Design a protein around this motif. Structure first.
Motif, PDB file in Angstrom:
ATOM      1  N   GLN A 134     167.702 -25.024 -58.134  1.00  0.00           N
ATOM      2  CA  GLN A 134     166.434 -26.079 -58.462  1.00  0.00           C
ATOM      3  C   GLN A 134     166.959 -26.877 -59.533  1.00  0.00           C
ATOM      4  O   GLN A 134     167.706 -26.240 -60.188  1.00  0.00           O
ATOM      5  CB  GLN A 134     165.247 -25.473 -58.798  1.00  0.00           C
ATOM      6  CG  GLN A 134     164.431 -24.858 -57.561  1.00  0.00           C
ATOM      7  CD  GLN A 134     163.317 -24.167 -57.997  1.00  0.00           C
ATOM      8  OE1 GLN A 134     163.281 -23.044 -58.688  1.00  0.00           O
ATOM      9  NE2 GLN A 134     162.015 -24.710 -57.664  1.00  0.00           N
ATOM     10  N   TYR A 135     166.639 -28.030 -59.717  1.00  0.00           N
ATOM     11  CA  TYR A 135     166.909 -28.994 -60.649  1.00  0.00           C
ATOM     12  C   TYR A 135     165.722 -29.928 -60.769  1.00  0.00           C
ATOM     13  O   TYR A 135     165.618 -30.741 -59.866  1.00  0.00           O
ATOM     14  CB  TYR A 135     168.114 -29.774 -60.115  1.00  0.00           C
ATOM     15  CG  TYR A 135     169.043 -30.536 -61.156  1.00  0.00           C
ATOM     16  CD1 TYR A 135     168.922 -31.890 -61.501  1.00  0.00           C
ATOM     17  CD2 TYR A 135     170.230 -30.056 -61.818  1.00  0.00           C
ATOM     18  CE1 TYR A 135     169.536 -32.245 -62.447  1.00  0.00           C
ATOM     19  CE2 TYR A 135     171.061 -30.616 -62.815  1.00  0.00           C
ATOM     20  CZ  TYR A 135     170.674 -31.886 -62.949  1.00  0.00           C
ATOM     21  OH  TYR A 135     171.454 -32.662 -63.959  1.00  0.00           O
ATOM     22  N   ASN A 136     165.219 -30.110 -61.773  1.00  0.00           N
ATOM     23  CA  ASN A 136     163.987 -30.934 -61.867  1.00  0.00           C
ATOM     24  C   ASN A 136     164.238 -32.256 -62.524  1.00  0.00           C
ATOM     25  O   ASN A 136     165.437 -32.720 -62.860  1.00  0.00           O
ATOM     26  CB  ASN A 136     163.000 -30.248 -62.765  1.00  0.00           C
ATOM     27  CG  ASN A 136     163.302 -30.412 -64.425  1.00  0.00           C
ATOM     28  OD1 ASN A 136     164.323 -30.530 -64.847  1.00  0.00           O
ATOM     29  ND2 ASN A 136     161.970 -29.907 -65.368  1.00  0.00           N
ATOM     30  N   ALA A 161     163.024 -34.075 -65.129  1.00  0.00           N
ATOM     31  CA  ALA A 161     163.371 -34.310 -66.633  1.00  0.00           C
ATOM     32  C   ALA A 161     165.010 -33.966 -66.824  1.00  0.00           C
ATOM     33  O   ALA A 161     165.536 -34.753 -67.432  1.00  0.00           O
ATOM     34  CB  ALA A 161     162.643 -33.063 -67.676  1.00  0.00           C
ATOM     35  N   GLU A 162     165.649 -33.033 -66.133  1.00  0.00           N
ATOM     36  CA  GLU A 162     167.082 -32.750 -66.351  1.00  0.00           C
ATOM     37  C   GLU A 162     167.779 -34.128 -65.875  1.00  0.00           C
ATOM     38  O   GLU A 162     168.533 -34.576 -66.519  1.00  0.00           O
ATOM     39  CB  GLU A 162     167.315 -31.708 -65.645  1.00  0.00           C
ATOM     40  CG  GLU A 162     169.176 -31.173 -65.986  1.00  0.00           C
ATOM     41  CD  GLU A 162     169.109 -30.915 -66.955  1.00  0.00           C
ATOM     42  OE1 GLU A 162     168.452 -30.402 -67.908  1.00  0.00           O
ATOM     43  OE2 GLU A 162     170.622 -30.864 -67.419  1.00  0.00           O
ATOM     44  N   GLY A 163     167.735 -34.591 -64.967  1.00  0.00           N
ATOM     45  CA  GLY A 163     167.849 -35.769 -64.148  1.00  0.00           C
ATOM     46  C   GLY A 163     168.051 -37.186 -65.055  1.00  0.00           C
ATOM     47  O   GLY A 163     168.810 -37.847 -65.298  1.00  0.00           O
ATOM     48  N   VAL A 200     179.577 -29.555 -61.141  1.00  0.00           N
ATOM     49  CA  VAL A 200     178.614 -30.792 -61.802  1.00  0.00           C
ATOM     50  C   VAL A 200     178.792 -30.557 -63.108  1.00  0.00           C
ATOM     51  O   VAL A 200     178.961 -31.847 -63.681  1.00  0.00           O
ATOM     52  CB  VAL A 200     177.418 -30.380 -61.257  1.00  0.00           C
ATOM     53  CG1 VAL A 200     176.240 -30.876 -62.186  1.00  0.00           C
ATOM     54  CG2 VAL A 200     176.892 -30.048 -59.983  1.00  0.00           C
ATOM     55  N   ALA A 201     179.392 -29.818 -63.819  1.00  0.00           N
ATOM     56  CA  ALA A 201     179.216 -29.617 -65.558  1.00  0.00           C
ATOM     57  C   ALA A 201     180.512 -28.878 -65.955  1.00  0.00           C
ATOM     58  O   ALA A 201     180.381 -27.956 -66.667  1.00  0.00           O
ATOM     59  CB  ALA A 201     178.021 -28.892 -65.818  1.00  0.00           C
ATOM     60  N   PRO A 202     181.792 -29.645 -65.530  1.00  0.00           N
ATOM     61  CA  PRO A 202     182.762 -28.834 -66.165  1.00  0.00           C
ATOM     62  C   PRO A 202     183.099 -28.677 -67.599  1.00  0.00           C
ATOM     63  O   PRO A 202     183.738 -27.849 -67.982  1.00  0.00           O
ATOM     64  CB  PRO A 202     183.974 -29.858 -65.377  1.00  0.00           C
ATOM     65  CG  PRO A 202     183.435 -31.133 -65.648  1.00  0.00           C
ATOM     66  CD  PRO A 202     181.702 -31.004 -65.102  1.00  0.00           C
ATOM     67  N   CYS A 203     182.425 -29.478 -68.421  1.00  0.00           N
ATOM     68  CA  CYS A 203     182.400 -29.294 -69.917  1.00  0.00           C
ATOM     69  C   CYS A 203     181.622 -28.164 -70.423  1.00  0.00           C
ATOM     70  O   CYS A 203     181.602 -27.750 -71.519  1.00  0.00           O
ATOM     71  CB  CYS A 203     181.796 -30.389 -70.563  1.00  0.00           C
ATOM     72  SG  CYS A 203     179.719 -30.580 -70.378  1.00  0.00           S
ATOM     73  N   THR A 204     180.905 -27.527 -69.382  1.00  0.00           N
ATOM     74  CA  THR A 204     180.221 -26.106 -69.759  1.00  0.00           C
ATOM     75  C   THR A 204     181.165 -25.002 -69.496  1.00  0.00           C
ATOM     76  O   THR A 204     180.881 -23.794 -69.508  1.00  0.00           O
ATOM     77  CB  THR A 204     178.745 -26.064 -69.149  1.00  0.00           C
ATOM     78  OG1 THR A 204     179.107 -25.819 -67.573  1.00  0.00           O
ATOM     79  CG2 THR A 204     178.176 -27.272 -69.281  1.00  0.00           C
ATOM     80  N   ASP A 242     178.964 -34.233 -72.019  1.00  0.00           N
ATOM     81  CA  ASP A 242     179.906 -35.337 -72.042  1.00  0.00           C
ATOM     82  C   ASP A 242     180.607 -35.553 -70.820  1.00  0.00           C
ATOM     83  O   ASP A 242     181.498 -36.431 -71.014  1.00  0.00           O
ATOM     84  CB  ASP A 242     180.684 -35.163 -73.447  1.00  0.00           C
ATOM     85  CG  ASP A 242     181.954 -34.086 -73.186  1.00  0.00           C
ATOM     86  OD1 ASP A 242     182.043 -33.432 -72.184  1.00  0.00           O
ATOM     87  OD2 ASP A 242     182.513 -33.980 -74.515  1.00  0.00           O
ATOM     88  N   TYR A 243     180.529 -35.246 -69.708  1.00  0.00           N
ATOM     89  CA  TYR A 243     181.154 -35.605 -68.521  1.00  0.00           C
ATOM     90  C   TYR A 243     180.486 -36.476 -67.684  1.00  0.00           C
ATOM     91  O   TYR A 243     179.526 -36.438 -67.257  1.00  0.00           O
ATOM     92  CB  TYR A 243     181.296 -34.273 -67.608  1.00  0.00           C
ATOM     93  CG  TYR A 243     181.958 -34.306 -66.351  1.00  0.00           C
ATOM     94  CD1 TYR A 243     183.585 -34.958 -66.390  1.00  0.00           C
ATOM     95  CD2 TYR A 243     181.703 -34.282 -64.972  1.00  0.00           C
ATOM     96  CE1 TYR A 243     184.457 -34.859 -65.456  1.00  0.00           C
ATOM     97  CE2 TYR A 243     182.222 -34.457 -64.014  1.00  0.00           C
ATOM     98  CZ  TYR A 243     183.836 -34.902 -64.135  1.00  0.00           C
ATOM     99  OH  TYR A 243     184.493 -34.820 -62.884  1.00  0.00           O
ATOM    100  N   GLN A 244     181.185 -37.669 -67.631  1.00  0.00           N
ATOM    101  CA  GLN A 244     180.877 -38.860 -66.849  1.00  0.00           C
ATOM    102  C   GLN A 244     179.437 -39.510 -67.169  1.00  0.00           C
ATOM    103  O   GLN A 244     178.758 -39.901 -66.713  1.00  0.00           O
ATOM    104  CB  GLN A 244     180.810 -38.659 -65.473  1.00  0.00           C
ATOM    105  CG  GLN A 244     182.126 -38.252 -64.801  1.00  0.00           C
ATOM    106  CD  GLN A 244     182.094 -38.133 -63.519  1.00  0.00           C
ATOM    107  OE1 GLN A 244     180.890 -37.978 -62.606  1.00  0.00           O
ATOM    108  NE2 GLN A 244     183.276 -37.866 -62.841  1.00  0.00           N
TER     109      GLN A 244
HETATM  110  C1  LIG Z   1     179.237 -31.233 -68.927  1.00  0.00           C
HETATM  111  O1  LIG Z   1     179.869 -31.454 -68.245  1.00  0.00           O
HETATM  112  C2  LIG Z   1     177.952 -31.237 -68.807  1.00  0.00           C
HETATM  113  C3  LIG Z   1     177.410 -31.806 -67.534  1.00  0.00           C
HETATM  114  C4  LIG Z   1     176.203 -31.433 -66.957  1.00  0.00           C
HETATM  115  C5  LIG Z   1     175.149 -30.753 -67.850  1.00  0.00           C
HETATM  116  C6  LIG Z   1     173.990 -30.566 -67.181  1.00  0.00           C
HETATM  117  C7  LIG Z   1     173.603 -31.275 -66.022  1.00  0.00           C
HETATM  118  O2  LIG Z   1     172.319 -31.158 -65.619  1.00  0.00           O
HETATM  119  C8  LIG Z   1     174.473 -31.971 -65.374  1.00  0.00           C
HETATM  120  C9  LIG Z   1     175.793 -32.059 -65.716  1.00  0.00           C
END
Ligand SMILES: *C(=O)/C=C/c1ccc(O)cc1
Length: 125
Positions: free
Chosen positions: A41-43, A45-47, A66-70, A97-99
């Protein structure tokens, strides 16, 4: 607006009752992950915070795709410890900070009430 406060002690009880549409009414970002890091799930507000389209990230792996910086001990490392332990409740600041324009956020990760699910909650600071 669904009235739930970021960081509420019993947030996982409150959110267990919400469909996708109700999750979109929250004042903060909310992501639900399975034990492997796939987005269930992905709401809305996050988008709004990250620019991602909620419907297009469901089914992707948060840490790989999606989130390689994490993908680091400070974020993913805490997640995988919690999955293996079966318990997770941690809050910390992070920079996405990714894209995207680097955006500082507060992150709350918490095991969901249901079996093999984990919440990631996000708000700006
Ligand atoms: C780091 O790459 C973070 C990316 C990211 C964080 C949270 C999201 O919902 C989507 C992308």
């Amino acid at each position: 607006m669904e009235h739930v406060a970021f960081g509420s002690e019993d947030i996982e009880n409150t959110l267990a009752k919400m469909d996708d549409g109700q999750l979109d009414g929250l004042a903060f970002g909310a992501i639900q992950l399975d034990g492997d890091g796939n987005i269930l799930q992905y709401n809305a507000a996050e988008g709004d915070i990250t620019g991602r389209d909620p419907k297009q990230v469901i089914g992707k792996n948060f840490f790989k795709d999606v989130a390689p910086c994490t993908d680091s001990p400070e974020f993913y490392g805490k997640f995988k410890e919690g999955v293996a332990s079966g318990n997770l409740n941690t809050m910390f600041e992070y920079t996405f900070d990714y894209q995207m324009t680097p955006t500082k956020v507060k992150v709350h990760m918490k095991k969901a009430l249901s079996g093999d699910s984990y919440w990631v909650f996000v708000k700006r600071v």
